[PDB]
Amino acid sequence: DDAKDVARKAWEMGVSDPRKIVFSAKIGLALTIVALLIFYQEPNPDLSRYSVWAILTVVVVFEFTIGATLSKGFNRALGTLSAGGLALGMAELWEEIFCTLSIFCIGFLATFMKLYPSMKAYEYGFRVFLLTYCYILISGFRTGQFIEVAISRFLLIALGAGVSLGVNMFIYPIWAGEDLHNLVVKNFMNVATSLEGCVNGYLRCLTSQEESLMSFAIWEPPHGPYKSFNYPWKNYVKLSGALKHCAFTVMALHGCILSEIQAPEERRQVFRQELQRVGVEGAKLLRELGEKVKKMEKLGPVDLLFEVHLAAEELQHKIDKKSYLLVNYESASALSLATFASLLIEFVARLQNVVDAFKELSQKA
Amino acid sequence: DDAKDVARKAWEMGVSDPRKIVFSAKIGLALTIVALLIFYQEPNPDLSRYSVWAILTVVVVFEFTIGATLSKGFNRALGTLSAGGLALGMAELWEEIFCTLSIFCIGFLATFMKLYPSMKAYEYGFRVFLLTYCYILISGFRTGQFIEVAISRFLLIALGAGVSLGVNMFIYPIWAGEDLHNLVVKNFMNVATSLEGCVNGYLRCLTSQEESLMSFAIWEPPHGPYKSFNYPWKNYVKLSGALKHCAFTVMALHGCILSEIQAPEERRQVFRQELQRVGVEGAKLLRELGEKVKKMEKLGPVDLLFEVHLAAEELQHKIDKKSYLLVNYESASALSLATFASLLIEFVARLQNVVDAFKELSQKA
Ligand SMILES: CCCCCCCCCCCC(=O)OC[C@H](COP(=O)([O-])O)OC(=O)CCCCCCCCCCC
Numbered sequence: 001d002d003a004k005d006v007a008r009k010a011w012e013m014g015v016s017d018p019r020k021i022v023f024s025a026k027i028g029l030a031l032t033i034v035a036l037l038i039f040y041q042e043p044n045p046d047l048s049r050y051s052v053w054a055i056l057t058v059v060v061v062f063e064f065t066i067g068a069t070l071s072k073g074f075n076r077a078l079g080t081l082s083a084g085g086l087a088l089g090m091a092e093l094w095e096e097i098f099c100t101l102s103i104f105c106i107g108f109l110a111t112f113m114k115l116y117p118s119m120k121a122y123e124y125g126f127r128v129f130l131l132t133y134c135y136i137l138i139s140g141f142r143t144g145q146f147i148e149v150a151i152s153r154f155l156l157i158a159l160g161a162g163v164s165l166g167v168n169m170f171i172y173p174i175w176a177g178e179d180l181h182n183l184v185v186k187n188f189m190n191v192a193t194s195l196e197g198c199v200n201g202y203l204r205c206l207t208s209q210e211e212s213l214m215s216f217a218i219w220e221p222p223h224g225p226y227k228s229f230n231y232p233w234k235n236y237v238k239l240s241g242a243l244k245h246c247a248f249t250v251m252a253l254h255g256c257i258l259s260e261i262q263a264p265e266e267r268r269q270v271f272r273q274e275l276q277r278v279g280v281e282g283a284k285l286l287r288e289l290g291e292k293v294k295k296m297e298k299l300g301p302v303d304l305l306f307e308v309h310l311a312a313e314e315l316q317h318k319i320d321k322k323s324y325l326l327v328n329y330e331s332a333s334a335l336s337l338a339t340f341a342s343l344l345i346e347f348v349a350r351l352q353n354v355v356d357a358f359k360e361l362s363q364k365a
Numbered sequence: 366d367d368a369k370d371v372a373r374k375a376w377e378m379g380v381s382d383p384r385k386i387v388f389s390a391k392i393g394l395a396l397t398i399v400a401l402l403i404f405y406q407e408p409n410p411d412l413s414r415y416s417v418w419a420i421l422t423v424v425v426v427f428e429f430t431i432g433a434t435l436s437k438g439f440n441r442a443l444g445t446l447s448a449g450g451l452a453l454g455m456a457e458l459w460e461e462i463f464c465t466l467s468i469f470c471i472g473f474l475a476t477f478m479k480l481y482p483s484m485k486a487y488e489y490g491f492r493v494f495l496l497t498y499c500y501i502l503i504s505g506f507r508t509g510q511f512i513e514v515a516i517s518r519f520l521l522i523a524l525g526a527g528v529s530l531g532v533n534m535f536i537y538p539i540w541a542g543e544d545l546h547n548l549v550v551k552n553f554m555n556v557a558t559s560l561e562g563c564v565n566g567y568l569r570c571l572t573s574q575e576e577s578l579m580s581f582a583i584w585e586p587p588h589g590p591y592k593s594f595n596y597p598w599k600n601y602v603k604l605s606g607a608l609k610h611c612a613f614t615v616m617a618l619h620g621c622i623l624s625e626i627q628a629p630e631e632r633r634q635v636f637r638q639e640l641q642r643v644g645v646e647g648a649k650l651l652r653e654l655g656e657k658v659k660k661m662e663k664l665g666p667v668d669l670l671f672e673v674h675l676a677a678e679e680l681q682h683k684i685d686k687k688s689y690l691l692v693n694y695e696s697a698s699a700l701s702l703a704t705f706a707s708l709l710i711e712f713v714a715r716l717q718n719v720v721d722a723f724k725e726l727s728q729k730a
């Protein structure tokens with residue numbers, strides 16, 4: 001019952017988003033290739049009980065997006081070497097006291113530098129730095145059994161990363177650039193539906209996830225339609241804030257939807273028809289820009305503000321001749337409708353920055 | 366230069382927040398005790414090159430808050446056993462094909478169940494389940510060298526967790542309940558400062574982080590002032606949303622601060638004095654509730670709405686006799702001030718739910 005229903009919902013999510021099955025199958029295939037290689041090409045126990053670092057490196061350095069693998073791994077690459085670099089300094093350097101004090105001070109400094117301000121996301125390298133240094137110190141005591149146990153833990157962790165890179169980079173690439181288009185376009189549609197729902201309701205009564213993907217996207221090679229290196233992936237994040245202004249405005253509109261001083265609807269149903277036209281014509285420019293961005297038409301947004309500007313102006317010179325319903329429990333309701341409509345003209349006025357911010361991007365791209 | 370300045374800023378942050386130094390020192394002490402114990406009580410190499418699981422368990426199962434350690438570890442506890450539980454089923458169970466198909470299907474199902482909906486936070490147990498099963502399968506091939514290499518990797522990982530629990534639970538406990546008070550009180554003050562800044566500006570011209578802590582807090586024992594088990598840690602999160610309503614309102618106020626249709630200030634400086642009194646008297650009830658929550662006075666919020674209600678009503682019957690500035694480029698500005706003031710009365714009206722939601726909590730506590 002519950003299991004079947006959950007599986008069904010997951011199935012619709014998977015067919016809607018086919019990346020889930022592909023990514024899971026890719027991880028499965030990488031684990032199978034590593035296990036098969038170990039169990040076939042090494043039946044001779046030169047080393048067959050200390051290779052659990054290959055499975056671990058495969059399961060840890062493999063992520064959803066290609067930019068993630070390349071850029072996040074490079075953080076781990078310098079992170080492992082930095083701890084190793086100081087390790088050689090403190091391996092050659094009466095012995096046990098120095099060992100303990102070093103292993104305590106280095107951990108202290110690493111932890112303090114990892115709990116600092118806005119890097120609470122650049123943190124895997126510091127865990128790497130702690131673990132590498134602790135690993136070297138818990139085992140390097142001998143200098144006779146050093147290399148034999150040390151390189152048997154580096155070669156196998158390197159030839160798990162090689163495969164986890166090749167398989168991920170040459171089977172269904174999940175390029176971070178495309179997901180940026182998917183996020184920047186879905187925003188337009190969902191905001192448009194939000195405005196439509198906002199305006200429909202008074203008459204009905206009887207950049208964290210967008211700039212992180214930019215950091216990933218600066219490392220992925222020019223795929224197909226992204227022509228040259230250093231593609232201007234700086235204006236996709238600047239268009240998002242331009243829309244986020246209007247997102248705040250429509251959020252205020254919804255806060256007006258669910259207010260506690262709502263108007264006496266019989267009174268509101270006098271100025272009741274022009275709002276719908278303003279909303280309908282405002283949704284159109286917002287859907288058309290999304291359509292322009294999705295296929296990336298290099299023809300330009302030529303003067304789309306016309307209909308919405310005319311609608312806004314006609315709304316402006318309609319609130320004014322019929323201003324008898326807005327001014328003089330009872331008094332508070334009157335100004336509410338004025339606050340109600342005064343936001344929408346602000347939406348149209350703010351809609352202009354979006355057009356400029358997309359015209360500059362369509363030229364810079 | 367840069368290093369000294371960064372260190373200084375970190376020093377002020379640390380003296381302001383002494384938990385950073387304490388937590389880092391505690392991790393350092395745990396690493397030192399583990400390393401000292403290994404290097405002193407085991408100079409005899411029964412096993413001294415395979416205990417790197419003690420250092421790892423210490424560095425991974427140790428977190429900031431006590432509730433984190435106990436509850437997150439329990440997720441790991443059943444996570445490791447669940448994979449181990451099926452492992453015995455698929456160890457007794459012609460051999461290699463079954464091995465590969467099992468290690469692929471189990472990984473597939475675990476990954477799919479980990480990339481599901483709103484658990485993107487309950488995910489460490491699934492990594493644990495993958496790693497345990499892969500570990501067992503990459504090594505259990507022998508059944509003669511099984512136990513010797515297996516228990517030498519369980520005893521040491523258990524007696525790193527024992528110390529990482531004891532040290533964290535009996536040296537400067539960082540109880541999750543107290544941080545809930547700190548977050549629920551800081552909110553009142555910062556929102557009050559936000560309102561004060563909002564109202565000061567038109568005349569100046571010439572629950573993700575609160576409900577997660579609740580889940581942690583349900584596992585920590587009754588410390589001191591929290592009397593009995595099953596303390597009502599359900600109303601601290603319900604008061605936060607009651608304040609979040611007004612947070613949305615003041616966010617709309619700030620959106621009005623930075624609008625593009627701002628009023629011609631010479632015109633606004635006519636109805637200019639009562640807003641300041643309304644804001645000042647509204648900040649007071651908002652600071653006093655924070656003071657009531659901070660020390661948790663069991664005396665009750667007895668009729669604090671009086672001053673703010675009177676201020677709101679006097680504002681109401683002031684917009685109305687002077688309504689000549691609000692109605693009839695020029696027309697749009699007029700209704701702006703009406704939207705301006707119509708929000709504030711909504712703030713006072715919404716302020717009532719907060720008092721009820723805190724009166725019920727002060728009785729239930
Ligand atoms: C060159 C490019 C490398 C690209 C990526 C290579 C590694 C990627 C790191 C991903 C996670 C990882 O491998 O862990 C580092 C391990 C210890 O971690 P764990 O296995 O305990 O989780 O620590 C170790 O593997 C031990 C190795 C320490 C010896 C390595 C340095 C030897 C001297 C190098 C100087 C050039």
Ligand SMILES: CCCCCCCCCCCC(=O)OC[C@H](COP(=O)([O-])O)OC(=O)CCCCCCCCCCC
Nearest residue numbers: 418421422426441442445449496497500518519522523526
């Ligand atoms: C009992 C309460 C325990 C409380 C916590 C104990 C462990 C806490 C887990 C924290 C992380 C951890 O230990 O990793 C699990 C390891 C493999 O992980 P890693 O060392 O590769 O990172 O996997 C292993 O350690 C291998 C152990 C597998 C044998 C354990 C099960 C044996 C049969 C148990 C049945 C009762």
